[PDB]
Amino acid sequence: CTAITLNGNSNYFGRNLDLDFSYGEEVIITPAEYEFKFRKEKAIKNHKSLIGVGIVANDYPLYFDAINEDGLGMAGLNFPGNAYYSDALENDKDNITPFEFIPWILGQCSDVNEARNLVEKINLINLSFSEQLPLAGLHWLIADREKSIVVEVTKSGVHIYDNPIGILTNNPEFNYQMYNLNKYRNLSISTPQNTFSDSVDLKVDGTGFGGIGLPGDVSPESRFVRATFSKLNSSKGMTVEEDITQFFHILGTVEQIKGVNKTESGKEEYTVYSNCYDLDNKTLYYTTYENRQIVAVTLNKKDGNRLVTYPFERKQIINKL
Amino acid sequence: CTAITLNGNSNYFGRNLDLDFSYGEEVIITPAEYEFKFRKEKAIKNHKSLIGVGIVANDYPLYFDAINEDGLGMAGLNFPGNAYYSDALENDKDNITPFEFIPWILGQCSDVNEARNLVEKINLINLSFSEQLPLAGLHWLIADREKSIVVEVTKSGVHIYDNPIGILTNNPEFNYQMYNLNKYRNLSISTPQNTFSDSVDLKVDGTGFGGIGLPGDVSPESRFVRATFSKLNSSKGMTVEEDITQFFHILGTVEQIKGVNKTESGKEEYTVYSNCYDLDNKTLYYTTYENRQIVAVTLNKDDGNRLVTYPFERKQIINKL
Amino acid sequence: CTAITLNGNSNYFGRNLDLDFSYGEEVIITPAEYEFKFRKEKAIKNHKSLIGVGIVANDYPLYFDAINEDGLGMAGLNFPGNAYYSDALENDKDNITPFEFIPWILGQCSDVNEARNLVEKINLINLSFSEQLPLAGLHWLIADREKSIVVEVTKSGVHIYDNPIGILTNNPEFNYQMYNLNKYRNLSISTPQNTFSDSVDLKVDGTGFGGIGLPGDVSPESRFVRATFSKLNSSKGMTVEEDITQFFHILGTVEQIKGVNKTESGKEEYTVYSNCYDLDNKTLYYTTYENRQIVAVTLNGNRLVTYPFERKQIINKLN
Amino acid sequence: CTAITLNGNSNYFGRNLDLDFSYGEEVIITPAEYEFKFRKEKAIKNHKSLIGVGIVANDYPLYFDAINEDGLGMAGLNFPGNAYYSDALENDKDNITPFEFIPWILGQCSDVNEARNLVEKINLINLSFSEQLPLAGLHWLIADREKSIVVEVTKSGVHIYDNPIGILTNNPEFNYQMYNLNKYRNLSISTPQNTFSDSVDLKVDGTGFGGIGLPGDVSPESRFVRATFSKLNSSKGMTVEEDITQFFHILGTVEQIKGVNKTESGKEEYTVYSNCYDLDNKTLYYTTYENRQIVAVTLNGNRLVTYPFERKQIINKL
Numbered sequence A: 001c002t003a004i005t006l007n008g009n010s011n012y013f014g015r016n017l018d019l020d021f022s023y024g025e026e027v028i029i030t031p032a033e034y035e036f037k038f039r040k041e042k043a044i045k046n047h048k049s050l051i052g053v054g055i056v057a058n059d060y061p062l063y064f065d066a067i068n069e070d071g072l073g074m075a076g077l078n079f080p081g082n083a084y085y086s087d088a089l090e091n092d093k094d095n096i097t098p099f100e101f102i103p104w105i106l107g108q109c110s111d112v113n114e115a116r117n118l119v120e121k122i123n124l125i126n127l128s129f130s131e132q133l134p135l136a137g138l139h140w141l142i143a144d145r146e147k148s149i150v151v152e153v154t155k156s157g158v159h160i161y162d163n164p165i166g167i168l169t170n171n172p173e174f175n176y177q178m179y180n181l182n183k184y185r186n187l188s189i190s191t192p193q194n195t196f197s198d199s200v201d202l203k204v205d206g207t208g209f210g211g212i213g214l215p216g217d218v219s220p221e222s223r224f225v226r227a228t229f230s231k232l233n234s235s236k237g238m239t240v241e242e243d244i245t246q247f248f249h250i251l252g253t254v255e256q257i258k259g260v261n262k263t264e265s266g267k268e269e270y271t272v273y274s275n276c277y278d279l280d281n282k283t284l285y286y287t288t289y290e291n292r293q294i295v296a297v298t299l300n301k302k303d304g305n306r307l308v309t310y311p312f313e314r315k316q317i318i319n320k321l
Numbered sequence B: 001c002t003a004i005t006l007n008g009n010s011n012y013f014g015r016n017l018d019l020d021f022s023y024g025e026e027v028i029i030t031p032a033e034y035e036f037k038f039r040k041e042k043a044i045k046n047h048k049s050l051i052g053v054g055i056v057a058n059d060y061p062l063y064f065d066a067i068n069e070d071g072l073g074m075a076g077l078n079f080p081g082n083a084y085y086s087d088a089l090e091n092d093k094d095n096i097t098p099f100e101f102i103p104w105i106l107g108q109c110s111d112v113n114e115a116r117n118l119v120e121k122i123n124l125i126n127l128s129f130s131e132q133l134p135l136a137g138l139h140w141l142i143a144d145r146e147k148s149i150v151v152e153v154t155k156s157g158v159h160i161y162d163n164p165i166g167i168l169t170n171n172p173e174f175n176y177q178m179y180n181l182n183k184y185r186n187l188s189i190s191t192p193q194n195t196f197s198d199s200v201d202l203k204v205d206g207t208g209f210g211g212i213g214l215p216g217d218v219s220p221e222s223r224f225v226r227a228t229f230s231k232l233n234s235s236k237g238m239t240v241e242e243d244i245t246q247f248f249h250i251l252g253t254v255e256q257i258k259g260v261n262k263t264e265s266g267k268e269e270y271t272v273y274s275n276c277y278d279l280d281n282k283t284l285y286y287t288t289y290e291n292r293q294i295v296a297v298t299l300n301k302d303d304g305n306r307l308v309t310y311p312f313e314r315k316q317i318i319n320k321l
Numbered sequence C: 001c002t003a004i005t006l007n008g009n010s011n012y013f014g015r016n017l018d019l020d021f022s023y024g025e026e027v028i029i030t031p032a033e034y035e036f037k038f039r040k041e042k043a044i045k046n047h048k049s050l051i052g053v054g055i056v057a058n059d060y061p062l063y064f065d066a067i068n069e070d071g072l073g074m075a076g077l078n079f080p081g082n083a084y085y086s087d088a089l090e091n092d093k094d095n096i097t098p099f100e101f102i103p104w105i106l107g108q109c110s111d112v113n114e115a116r117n118l119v120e121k122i123n124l125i126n127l128s129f130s131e132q133l134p135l136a137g138l139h140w141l142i143a144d145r146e147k148s149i150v151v152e153v154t155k156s157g158v159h160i161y162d163n164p165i166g167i168l169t170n171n172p173e174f175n176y177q178m179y180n181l182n183k184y185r186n187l188s189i190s191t192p193q194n195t196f197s198d199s200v201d202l203k204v205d206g207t208g209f210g211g212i213g214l215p216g217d218v219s220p221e222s223r224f225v226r227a228t229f230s231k232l233n234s235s236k237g238m239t240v241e242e243d244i245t246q247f248f249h250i251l252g253t254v255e256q257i258k259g260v261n262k263t264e265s266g267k268e269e270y271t272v273y274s275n276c277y278d279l280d281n282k283t284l285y286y287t288t289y290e291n292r293q294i295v296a297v298t299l300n301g302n303r304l305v306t307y308p309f310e311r312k313q314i315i316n317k318l319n
Numbered sequence D: 001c002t003a004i005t006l007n008g009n010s011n012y013f014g015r016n017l018d019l020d021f022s023y024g025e026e027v028i029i030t031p032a033e034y035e036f037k038f039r040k041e042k043a044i045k046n047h048k049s050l051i052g053v054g055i056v057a058n059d060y061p062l063y064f065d066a067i068n069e070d071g072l073g074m075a076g077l078n079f080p081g082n083a084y085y086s087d088a089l090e091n092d093k094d095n096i097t098p099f100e101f102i103p104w105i106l107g108q109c110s111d112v113n114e115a116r117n118l119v120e121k122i123n124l125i126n127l128s129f130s131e132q133l134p135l136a137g138l139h140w141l142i143a144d145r146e147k148s149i150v151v152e153v154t155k156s157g158v159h160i161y162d163n164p165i166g167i168l169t170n171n172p173e174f175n176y177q178m179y180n181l182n183k184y185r186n187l188s189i190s191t192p193q194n195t196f197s198d199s200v201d202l203k204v205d206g207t208g209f210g211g212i213g214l215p216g217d218v219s220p221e222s223r224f225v226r227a228t229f230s231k232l233n234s235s236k237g238m239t240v241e242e243d244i245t246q247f248f249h250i251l252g253t254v255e256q257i258k259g260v261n262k263t264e265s266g267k268e269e270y271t272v273y274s275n276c277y278d279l280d281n282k283t284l285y286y287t288t289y290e291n292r293q294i295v296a297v298t299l300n301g302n303r304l305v306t307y308p309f310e311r312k313q314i315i316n317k318l
């Protein structure tokens, strides 16, 4: 998985979901008066409305990622083995399951400071949604129109990082990803001067030589470096449309095509879908592996207590002339 | 620029056009009885029909790339400094300008073997279309449903290479590009064994580790290696639609986004358009930097002697629910 | 800097000293009855004798690295910005200066377990030797014949890591250096199979294709990966002499030649000396930038004994 | 294998010999009146003297590398599959075995231009020294005190390149090795500025970040790049002694240690010896995998003079 923010004409948050299979993902709107039940905390009958991508099970929205009516976003990304969910409750903490964590923050917080304040009081508990849907190790990107934080809950506790670049992938831990960038300082968007030696006339027979050393593989570290280089150098858009266009191109640079990454099951890991939330206009834009055409759904914060779902089109929608 | 072939349910040929501006590209269908005039050879009044992408100037189709009604494809890709157009006519060769070369081959040839016959007899001449459209250095991929060749006309002569992988980018010369793959033999689609040393317990905390080493930059050699890796390991599809989808994902792994590749003059190189020709069904599929949605145009049976054009639309066509 | 251990026919510990100038490095034997004086701790009149490399200022042995009579070895390597030296004394700790740290451990400790329990009680304090020899930030490799530890005193406190590979360079911190090896698991001593794709006939026109991916530069992370690869795959020696020879070849893989690493000052960082200590036979073997010939000095009570380095190339001229 | 040149106070030429065993290498002086016998050409009774490294077999000097009394150098380096030895004689050429090739050039040529002219007239014939010592594909660096050329005899003919950097390893062919440097133009001897982006605070916690991207393996292309970088950036010496010290440091950056490069047979490739020839003083310095101390022999009969290489660590005990 790769999650990014982008600051342009509007402000953006979105992700690639990289898995061996789809899980029946769909757009889920959770309205202000859908009652959020928690395993070890008091129900919330009144909260911020959410739009996100996930699955519904037992009438519960299980989000991969979502935003709320205030343009606060959150995404869960794979964090295998490093994630630690506590088998003990905590007296003066909010005891919340991984699968409740997005509803817990996005339901109640308007921005990243409020989100940080609530995470500081959290105890993530090792309770599965069900026997059929056991817990996976995750970390989180929480983003508003201004800034983002990374939440990693490991054996050493609840770790909250200011994300200075608005980039997250998978393992290793965030300080390791940020440190790993340092060895790529010499990369450039333009042709380098010959610093190798002026005793040999080295020639340039094409463009893009300043990039030489950027990794091209789909390991999480390589995707972290590549997404950061692509995002931080990406040209500004004149319009929101150009920003959304640029957002999909950036996610495109770290996309996993079917065949290059074969899991232990023999199944290829691929980018199941890509999305771009316009935080200011509370609009979800998404593409899927099977369909290039961008789909848009807007969150109207109106009321209701029923989850509203829109299934994914998993056919290539071609303009035939 | 990147050009590729793919063998699936049908058989495909197509390219990324990488440039810092748009020429106002369009689909151009040249019918059978559109008369091809040549600066230094006899006119061809009856020939194979073409569908491709480029511009029309003085009612002449200037193809960037095209196919004919037999499923033979030809693409011109940037080859600066290495391309050599002759200041001499040769009495025992066909004297053909670079801009006539696609009409010359696709108008007259049904397969790669016949294209090879005409290229063996060709002398590309240093004669420009017009003042506003000067000659720039090109090399070509010629492809049918079975195979492909690379034509490089340099100071040392007319070079034809069998293309064992169906991949072409820019400089360097094809023998150099193919030799440069040899160093990447150790790359893998799967998590490799620890061959570093069994004296240290090296851990794997994510998928995609076997690709570590694959270059990620947009230099022509890095794109050559990355296109080759992505294409040769691409998963098979069970439909033509899945092949077309997969084709655009492969071209996406080597696409240039606005801002990562900046020239001396400060121009931002980007992937202006991506296309996929179905050679068996004679159908062009394309996308633009500005529009993710695939557009399709079939070459139908004649009749006509007039060029038929479909201008590229450069606006994001979003599906709004 | 690069420090390594090697377990062969004997057991070995040694290092490259990488700097932009020579301090006049020499062999220094601190005999058992040389009195070690500390700025904030009681003196040690009777201790383990030490043999090492460094300089003498004010009749004090300023060791770069050394071993004691028990074959316990300690080397200080550059650790800029991460090293923390305390401006406070501590009642419940030993208050030792960085330049005192090698004498404090090696003078009193015969093995790594004893070194570790003594380091667990240390408070490294922010006191320079002189105006003309101020504190540079360091981390330490401590090695006996069985195993080795890394000591990093930083702002988060006194970190002691088991060293499963017997390798140390400079920044970053040890957990970072070790994690950084994971991405090189694919490297090999043998010609790999074509795993890129069986649909293209990739040719091998030379030996050594399995190491493609190994970093060649003199950055501290690159030297860590390359020393690890070269050390773990180095052929066994049949003798002690062959183990020594292999040791100098291993340090040779990550040596800095003059010209390839130009500092902020504009001076060339270079391997001033390479050494190999035989822990079991208490012997110091060393080479210098200027002199390829290996020099050997054995440890076997009052005054420092010194042997200056030759900075001339000692060439066996036949006729 | 890696061969280099170096121009400083004097002028130098030398190489690592990378192999998975030792032939029993030795210093060989061939005096001016040792008779050079050839399989298909007239013998030479009187010629320029040579000092170099090789083996003697059938009382013949089989040079791995050598220089002559004019400080013209020539080394043979592994060039497997690419080397083309002709099966036919050619009357308008000199018909010369690869193993005769060094004696042939260094015997008669004073400088690089004269070696060029003689090489131009050459046909390298496919005759083995003996059944015990069969042909192996080789290419050649020929250096004097001013410049070097590369001789690669392939299926497309006798190729001579000006070597602008004074570097040679193995495969690939020279134009490919030279083109391959272009992608390293961004490498530096000093810490680079952050060109990655002005929007992230990338930190430098050590020296040598400029070299990141330099290949560290012992493949022939990686050694070509690393030997080029090391050599072209190496600091100037103030004396001949400092130059020779620098030469071996340079050969050191690309040497092969036992265990990192295992061949087809499971044999360990390693740098059997390293040598620096001072061309102006006609002196051979050499080291061995087993002996770090430098050994030296100057080029001052009709019999070969030989000095067996020592494969023992000559240690200065204090």
Ligand SMILES: C[C@H](CCC(=O)NCCS(=O)(=O)O)[C@H]1CC[C@H]2[C@@H]3[C@H](O)C[C@@H]4C[C@H](O)CC[C@]4(C)[C@H]3C[C@H](O)[C@]12C
Pocket: A206, A207, B001, B017, B018, B019, B020, B023, B054, B055, B062, B063, B064, B076, B077, B078, B098, B099, B128, B129, B133, B134, B135, B136, B170, B220, B256, B261, B269
């Ligand atoms: C400029 C194009 C090549 C792209 C390029 O220059 N690359 C930039 C650097 S990189 O990619 O990022 O490496 C080439 C490809 C096809 C060319 C066009 C076609 O060949 C058709 C005609 C041919 C005429 O001779 C000239 C005008 C022209 C209309 C050409 C103009 C231009 O040279 C084009 C559009």
Ligand SMILES: C[C@H](CCC(=O)NCCS(=O)(=O)O)[C@H]1CC[C@H]2[C@@H]3[C@H](O)C[C@@H]4C[C@H](O)CC[C@]4(C)[C@H]3C[C@H](O)[C@]12C
Pocket: A019, A023, A055, A062, A063, A064, A076, A078, A079, A080, A098, A099, A128, A129, A133, A134, A135, A136, A138, A170, A171, A220, B205, B206, B207, B208
């Ligand atoms: C099986 C998936 C993880 C596979 C994995 O281990 N990834 C390795 C990638 S890498 O090494 O980091 O490269 C996880 C990741 C996200 C998970 C889903 C999401 O977290 C959302 C809900 C959460 C509910 O608790 C369970 C159902 C579920 C719909 C989850 C099912 C499943 O456990 C998923 C799909």
Ligand SMILES: C[C@H](CCC(=O)NCCS(=O)(=O)O)[C@H]1CC[C@H]2[C@@H]3[C@H](O)C[C@@H]4C[C@H](O)CC[C@]4(C)[C@H]3C[C@H](O)[C@]12C
Pocket: C205, C206, C207, D001, D017, D018, D019, D023, D054, D055, D062, D063, D064, D076, D077, D078, D079, D080, D098, D099, D129, D133, D134, D135, D136, D138, D170, D171, D220
């Ligand atoms: C084996 C040596 C080259 C090293 C090598 O094989 N390394 C492999 C590097 S790579 O795969 O190309 O990457 C070569 C270099 C010089 C050669 C020798 C000299 O040229 C002298 C004679 C010449 C005779 O023709 C054959 C025997 C011989 C005694 C040669 C034996 C062998 O072919 C040597 C020693």
Ligand SMILES: C[C@H](CCC(=O)NCCS(=O)(=O)O)[C@H]1CC[C@H]2[C@@H]3[C@H](O)C[C@@H]4C[C@H](O)CC[C@]4(C)[C@H]3C[C@H](O)[C@]12C
Pocket: C001, C018, C019, C020, C023, C054, C055, C062, C063, C064, C076, C077, C078, C079, C080, C098, C099, C128, C129, C133, C134, C135, C136, C137, C170, C171, C220, C269, D205, D206, D207, D208
């Ligand atoms: C300067 C040396 C290390 C620095 C270096 O150049 N490393 C390069 C690697 S990088 O930058 O981290 O990348 C260190 C190693 C051991 C140190 C010396 C020894 O500890 C002995 C004394 C101790 C005194 O406190 C200071 C003077 C001194 C004589 C020290 C001077 C300097 O601090 C030395 C010589």
